[PDB]
RNA sequence: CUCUUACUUUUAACCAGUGAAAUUGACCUGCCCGUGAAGAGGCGGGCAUAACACAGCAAGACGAGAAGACCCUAUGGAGCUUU
RNA sequence: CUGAACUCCUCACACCCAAUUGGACCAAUCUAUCACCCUAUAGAAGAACUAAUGUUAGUAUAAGUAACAUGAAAACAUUCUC
RNA sequence: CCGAGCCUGGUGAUAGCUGGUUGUCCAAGAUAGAAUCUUAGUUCAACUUUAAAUUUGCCCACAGAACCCUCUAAAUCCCCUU
RNA sequence: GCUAAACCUAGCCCCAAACCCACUCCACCUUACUACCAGACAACCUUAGCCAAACCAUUUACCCAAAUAAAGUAUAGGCGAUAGAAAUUGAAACCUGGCGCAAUAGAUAUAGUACCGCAAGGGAAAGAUGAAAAAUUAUAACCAAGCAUAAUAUAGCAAGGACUAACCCCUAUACCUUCUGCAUAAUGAAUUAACUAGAAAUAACUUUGCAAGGAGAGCCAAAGCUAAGACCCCCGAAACCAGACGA
């Protein structure tokens, strides 16, 4: 939800066209009084309380809490037997079949999101098994979330990617309340 | 028209219902009928009235000769 | 817009076994879109209901309002249709078991009226429904006799049971 | 909502409003309680507890010279430029338990706190700095990406 | 006690 | 409603109780999914309960057919012929338990 | 009041009371008696002495002005040498 | 997002199926129906004080009919029965006048006993012991 | 009347397409990515919602002062008349005060 | 006018054709006395009472029509006059 | 003796005040993930109508009522009456 | 429908005034008064609701609370115990 | 059994990106769309008022060239309502997407047409087979009100309790609104379908995180700080002002 704009949008009762003039005088017709033929009790009048977007639902947790469901989501899949550490992506072949063949003789899951350091220094030939495949997703360390984690069953890390996370996750559990943002230059940051 | 799909498949239903009874089917067999098991719906004829039934002879009282006799044209017909 | 009455002729029963009896022929017809009430034509489809085709033919013969003279044209060719598609062997031994109006697709002009006031007025429509049947007319149900009147009273003195005990 | 009125209908009067009446905010004369508020100057306070606090933890080093871009490197106090803060003012609190030889340089220093200071062996000075050179001396990273 | 006086109003032709 | 409704006299089936008590249950269809929330209380019903239920009524026949399926439900036939379709759906064992026992208690 | 201005849509103070008003941190309000400057020929010795004194307002009144005024005058100041420091905070107050 | 009720037409059949029976516009017209099978309901609950009370009142109707045959009177059979600690309501009392007349008879002098024996204490200062039927067992 | 006479056509969706696949990949690029950027920064949309969140009248107003200057004419004004009824509503109709 | 009457035409009613409008909470829509938001077809106590069209009448339905124009209220309007 | 929603008896129990206030559930719709004869956990919102002389459309009531219309005969040529 | 025309726009004019205000279920819940161009309204208090903290609240024994004065009033206030 | 019912497309909305901008011939400022004759007329100028202030009379926010912050601060003001800066600080930026509508919705739009008005101006309604209609004696039926199939039998808000039994017996003063109080002869409503009305700050409470520190520069802080959740409707005057159109 933090980054949904909704673009839903109404007219209100001054928007619609026309509808300037009284209809009809205020006493003696018999009839109901009206001041517009767009007025929200009328057939094509306006909407009374309607979307007015586009409407942003932007808002940040705080840092702490985003880097602390990360370690949850990374315990929760050790302890359900659904993490599996590796020292290398690289496949004896770029057919995707033998990636889907070795995911079920191991009795991964259905889905599995491998988990690469970088994004330049990824294999080719598992880049090209996962690239046409739709379960077997490849992603870089930095792209790690914890809705990702959630959809596939499977969470494949390398050991690079270990104490990549190690590293950054823990760097919150002692650090200083910051003085000006962690982009800017610090004594020991980055590293 | 109106999004959704949950009234319309609710509609189908009482509309099936009130077909039913402008039309009602005919009558069938329980047997013809899912869910039934004739070896294990004859012993609990016994169990449920507390007697000490024998099998073999409980599920000849059942067989008519009209069954019988029907049952060998069917036979006939398939060369069976 | 409905058109089930044109259908019901369209149905093809199964042959009959020999220990059967005779199946009495029904014959659908109907006429769609009269410039006619059918609050008006209702009064002549009440006459005829139950009469026979002959006798029916003669009360619409002699009749002075519109509705006659063209329920008489669909009973006349109904008669005729009945002997040459729906094989029924006489064409006097027939009557209507069923007829009917009906509210047709109607049109909406304006009836002005003073002081720059107006109305809506309607062009009305009908349809008229009939159904044949082979046979002679059912004989009308005698008015209940004193002795059905006593014989019912009684039986309701035997039903009678007591009320609120055991 | 309520029945009718001014209450079902959304239309009560402002706040304040006492229904006619001279208000409880109007009837009450005027006096200077903040009258020049925004030009007065504030000095957040220094105990020297905090002080031996953050220096047992080797937040602030004594070794060096303190001044107030360590303290705030060491967020040992949180000085607001812009909330017409002029710096820190070294208060007494603490005085008796203090025990760090430092060399200190503070805004405001009351004269417990200097013989506090004093007595251990060190050395404590009163320097001004105003409010554009206050900014900088606490946030020195941000004024060098700057190019002045 | 003013002449009160509404005029007629006629609708869409096209109706 | 009752004007708006239909009634009937007590009675009972073939004299029952008089000579000998006769189980009027004669038949339970369950229709549970393998997969589905709605069917979590009907399949640890199945697991557990009712095996020993079937036990303490063996006059009553129990078909459980495992199916895909959004609504759980059980069929109650009985010996007169009556036929009762009850829906089990998102209810705990317990509640599964007490509406079968009633099931077999009816005549 | 206004709850959303026009170019910032943010609360707005209400100036009248800030310059009769004063808002210590703990959250009580002092003022000034209505008629202290006033007619003071034909008032006693007695009733100019509580005319002249600085007192406190109640729940309802500071309930009050602290919805006519924004976080910014409720915040903790740092004054130098001000009269009312050792006001901002309450002491062996319960409940 | 735009959301519109897609089952208003279950929503008012649960209404109609109880308005089946009216008369009238108030049997297929949602706006007429609602308010008398309101109506209807509200009956029905109050209905079951009105039952439990006329109830009573055929019972003890039928017992002083049964009474009047024996030369009773409600009062004397009822209050003379409890004298005689027999504890037979009026619904009892009714279907047995019904079902088992030799019984209400009996009953019946039974009270015309007791009742001709309280008279006699009446009339004696005391020193007359009780009557047979006069007698009440205790329970400790 | 007023409620649909056969079933709508079944309603497929692929749950493992690019985008649902790839969902709320890069949030978490500032934590591990040295803060080089901020999540809002991925935030696509209007240039006066990019990282923001108001009211309507908040909204209208920060429309109107970021690209007001290339609105067009019928759809400025009504923003204009926008702000003037949302101003009067927020600020002197409600049930509190 | 006392004091009305007769005839003709229109209307009228019946047959045929065409076919509006205001109105309408639902109605299985009686009388007397009493009661009651103080004037009851609907409540209480009594009386009356098979069902049904057509033509007439205008006592009632506080009958229809127009959110009373008289009167008062609104920190509601407007026209005119003025030291 | 009759006589209540008072009280007892058998079983059960949150289950009879306007404005106002607090709380427990929930229909349908969309989205995420499940599910797969129609559901689940959550997140969202143009999210529920027996009443505004309400808006539009349809169809009743009044009512087959009010009201409307074509000079005559004949050979349809023509003539007659006004 | 000229005590001052019509159209569009400002305009969703304003209205302390009338009308209307859409699912289920339970619960607590009727109020001295002051000011006000104010009495068809509002603000404060009082009553009422929810959460929290703490310790007393209700009922009430003696003793005790005015002279001037016409009803030598029914009563109240205070108050441990219970 | 009629009348009807039902549908999914037409297109539309909000963003992003990109600046934008004609043509066959002939005719068109005179009475426009009219081939062809003596002329000289020429453009610029503070908006006001409704409203708020519970009247009103000074006054009462209206993009004006960078998001944030400084700050609703300085300051202005029947010092009332309310209005309101700057110095200074300094961010990001990949059009081809949608927890947007789906024929009473969404553009008024099938069209600024039909129609109304002298004129300025106002301003609609609606469509639905199938692969094939060069398969049209075709695409089944079942659903609103309204009628028909099928008028009616003492007595009464029309039901409920019931009953062998529809009625007969017993019990029962329609609904909403508005009121001290309504069966009231007080208001509204013929009925069906669809459409038609609670928008948010301050503080506080609840549930996480971290903790004398909190927060992804700004701000707060004598257990606080960050984040989230959860409270503020609809229709209606007579009027006022500006600019056009009309003898
Ligand atoms: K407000
Ligand atoms: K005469
Ligand atoms: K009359
Ligand atoms: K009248
Ligand atoms: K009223
Ligand atoms: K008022
Ligand atoms: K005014
Ligand atoms: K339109
Ligand atoms: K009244
Ligand atoms: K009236
Ligand atoms: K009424
Ligand atoms: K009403
Ligand atoms: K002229
Ligand atoms: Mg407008
Ligand atoms: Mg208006
Ligand atoms: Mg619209
Ligand atoms: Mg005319
Ligand atoms: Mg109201
Ligand atoms: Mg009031
Ligand atoms: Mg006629
Ligand atoms: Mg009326
Ligand atoms: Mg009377
Ligand atoms: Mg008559
Ligand atoms: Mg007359
Ligand atoms: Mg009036
Ligand atoms: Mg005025
Ligand atoms: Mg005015
Ligand atoms: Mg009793
Ligand atoms: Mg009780
Ligand atoms: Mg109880
Ligand atoms: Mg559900
Ligand atoms: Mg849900
Ligand atoms: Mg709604
Ligand atoms: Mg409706
Ligand atoms: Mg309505
Ligand atoms: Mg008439
Ligand atoms: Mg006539
Ligand atoms: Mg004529
Ligand atoms: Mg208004
Ligand atoms: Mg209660
Ligand atoms: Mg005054
Ligand atoms: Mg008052
Ligand atoms: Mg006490
Ligand atoms: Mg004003
Ligand atoms: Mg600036
Ligand atoms: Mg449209
Ligand atoms: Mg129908
Ligand atoms: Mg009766
Ligand atoms: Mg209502
Ligand atoms: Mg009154
Ligand atoms: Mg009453
Ligand atoms: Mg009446
Ligand atoms: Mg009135
Ligand atoms: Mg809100
Ligand atoms: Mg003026
Ligand atoms: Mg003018
Ligand atoms: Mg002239």
Redesign the interface.
Same mark, same amino acid.
């Given at each position: 939800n933090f980054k949904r704009i909704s673009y839903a949008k109404t007219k209100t009762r001054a928007e619609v066209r026309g509808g300037g003039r009284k209809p009809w005088p205020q006493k003696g017709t018999g009839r109901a009084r009206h001041g517009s033929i767009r007025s929200p009790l009328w057939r094509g009048g306006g909407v009374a309380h309607g979307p007015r977007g586009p409407t942003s639902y932007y808002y940040m947790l705080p840092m702490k809490v985003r880097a602390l469901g990360l370690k949850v989501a990374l315990t929760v899949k050790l302890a359900q037997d659904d993490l599996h550490i590796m020292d290398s992506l690289e496949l004896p072949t770029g057919d995707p079949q033998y990636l889907t063949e070795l995911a079920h003789y191991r009795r991964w899951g259905d889905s599995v999101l491998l988990v690469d350091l970088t994004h330049e220094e990824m294999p080719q030939s598992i880049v090209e098994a996962t690239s046409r495949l739709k379960t077997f997703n490849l992603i870089p360390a930095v792209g790690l979330n914890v809705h990702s984690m959630l959809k596939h069953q499977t969470l494949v890390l390398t050991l690079p990617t270990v104490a990549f996370l190690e590293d950054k996750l823990l760097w919150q559990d002692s650090r200083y309340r910051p003085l000006y943002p962690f982009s800017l230059p610090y004594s020991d940051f980055p590293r | 028209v109106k999004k959704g799909f949950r009234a319309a498949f609710r509609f189908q239903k009482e509309l099936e219902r009130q077909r039913l009874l402008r039309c009602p089917p005919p009558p069938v067999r329980r047997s013809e009928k899912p869910n039934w098991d004739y070896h294990a719906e004859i012993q609990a004829f016994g169990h449920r009235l507390q007697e000490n039934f024998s099998l073999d002879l409980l599920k000849t009282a059942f067989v008519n000769s009209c069954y019988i006799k029907s049952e060998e044209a069917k036979r006939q017909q398939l060369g069976i | 817009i409905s058109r089930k009455w044109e259908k019901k002729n369209k149905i093809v029963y199964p042959p009959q076994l020999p220990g059967e009896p005779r199946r009495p022929a029904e014959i659908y017809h109907c006429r769609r879109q009269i410039k006619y009430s059918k609050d008006k034509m209702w009064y002549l489809a009440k006459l005829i209901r139950g009469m026979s085709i002959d006798q029916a033919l003669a009360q619409l013969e002699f009749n002075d309002k519109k509705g006659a003279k063209i329920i008489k044209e669909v009973l006349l060719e109904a008669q005729d249709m009945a002997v040459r598609d729906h094989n029924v062997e006489f064409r006097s031994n027939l009557y209507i078991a069923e007829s009917t109006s009906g509210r047709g697709q109607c049109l909406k002009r304006i009836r002005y009226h003073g002081r720059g006031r107006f109305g809506i007025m309607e062009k009305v429509y009908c349809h008229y429904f009939v159904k044949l049947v082979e046979g002679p007319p059912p004989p009308p149900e005698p008015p209940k006799t004193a002795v059905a009147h006593a014989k019912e009273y009684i039986q309701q003195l035997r039903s009678r049971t007591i009320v609120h005990t055991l | 909502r309520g029945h009718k009125g001014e209450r079902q209908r959304g239309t009560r009067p402002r706040l304040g409003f006492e229904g006619g009446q001279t208000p409880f905010y109007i009837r009450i004369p005027k006096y200077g309680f903040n009258e020049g508020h925004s030009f007065r100057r504030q000095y957040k306070p220094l105990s020297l507890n905090r002080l031996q606090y953050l220096i047992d933890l080797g937040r602030v080093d004594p070794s060096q010279p303190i001044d107030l871009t360590q303290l705030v490197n060491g967020r040992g106090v949180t000085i607001q430029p812009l909330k017409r803060d002029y710096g820190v003012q070294l208060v007494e609190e603490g005085a008796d338990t203090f025990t760090a030889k430092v060399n200190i340089e503070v805004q405001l220093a009351s004269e417990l706190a200097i013989a506090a200071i004093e007595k251990n062996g060190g050395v404590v000075t009163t320097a001004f700095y105003d409010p554009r050179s206050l900014d900088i001396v606490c946030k020195p990273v941000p004024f060098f990406l700057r190019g002045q | 006690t003013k002449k009160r006086f509404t005029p007629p109003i006629y609708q869409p032709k096209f109706k | 409603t009752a004007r708006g409704t239909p009634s009937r006299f007590l009675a009972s089936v073939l004299h029952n109780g008089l000579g000998r008590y006769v189980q009027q249950l004669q038949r339970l269809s369950f229709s549970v999914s393998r997969d589905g929330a709605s069917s979590r209380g009907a399949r640890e019903f199945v697991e557990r309960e009712v095996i020993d239920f079937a036990r303490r009524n063996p006059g009553v026949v129990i078909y459980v057919n495992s199916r895909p399926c959004c609504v759980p439900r059980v069929v109650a036939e009985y010996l007169n012929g009556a036929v009762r379709e009850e829906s089990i759906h998102c209810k705990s064992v317990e509640e599964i338990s007490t509406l079968v026992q009633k099931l077999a208690d009816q005549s | *009041?206004?709850?959303?201005s026009?170019?910032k849509?943010k609360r707005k103070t209400?100036k009248?009371?800030?310059?009769?008003? *004063?808002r210590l941190h703990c959250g009580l309000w002092?003022?000034? /008696?209505?008629g202290? /400057?006033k007619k003071l020929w034909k008032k006693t010795p007695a009733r100019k002495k509580r005319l002249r004194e600085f007192v406190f307002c109640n729940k309802t009144?500071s309930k *009050? *002005?602290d /919805?006519?005024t924004t976080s910014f %005058?409720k915040?903790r100041? %740092?004054?130098?040498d001000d009269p009312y420091q050792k006001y901002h905070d309450r002491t062996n107050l319960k409940v | 997002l735009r959301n519109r009720v897609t089952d208003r037409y279950f929503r008012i059949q649960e209404v109609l199926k109880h308005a089946r029976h009216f008369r009238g516009r108030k049997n297929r017209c949602y706006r007429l129906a609602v308010r008398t099978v309101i109506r209807a309901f509200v009956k029905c609950t109050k209905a079951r004080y009105l039952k439990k009370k006329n109830m009573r009142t055929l019972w003890i109707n039928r017992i002083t009919a049964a009474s009047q045959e024996h030369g009773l009177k409600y009062p004397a059979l009822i209050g003379n029965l409890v004298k005689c600690q027999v504890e037979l309501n009026r619904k009892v009392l009714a279907d047995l006048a019904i079902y088992e007349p030799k019984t209400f008879k009996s009953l019946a002098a039974l009270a015309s006993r007791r009742r001709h024996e309280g008279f006699a204490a009446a009339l004696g200062d005391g020193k007359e012991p009780e009557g047979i039927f006069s007698r009440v067992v205790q329970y400790h | 009347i007023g409620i649909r006479l056969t079933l709508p056509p079944p309603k497929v969706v692929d749950r493992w397409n690019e985008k649902r696949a790839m969902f709320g990949v890069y949030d978490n690029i500032g934590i591990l990515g040295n803060f080089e950027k901020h999540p809002k920064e991925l935030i696509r949309g209007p240039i006066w919602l990019r990282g923001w969140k108001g009211n309507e009248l908040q909204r209208c107003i920060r429309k109107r002062k970021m690209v007001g200057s290339r609105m067009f004419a019928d759809d400025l004004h009504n923003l204009n008349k926008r702000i003037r009824y949302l101003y009067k509503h927020f600020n002197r109709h409600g049930k509190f005060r």
């Open positions: - | - | - | - | - | - | *009041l206004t709850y959303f026009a170019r849509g209400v009248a009371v800030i310059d009769r008003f *004063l002092v003022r000034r /008696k209505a202290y /400057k009144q *009050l *002005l /919805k006519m %005058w915040r100041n %740092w004054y130098v | - | -």
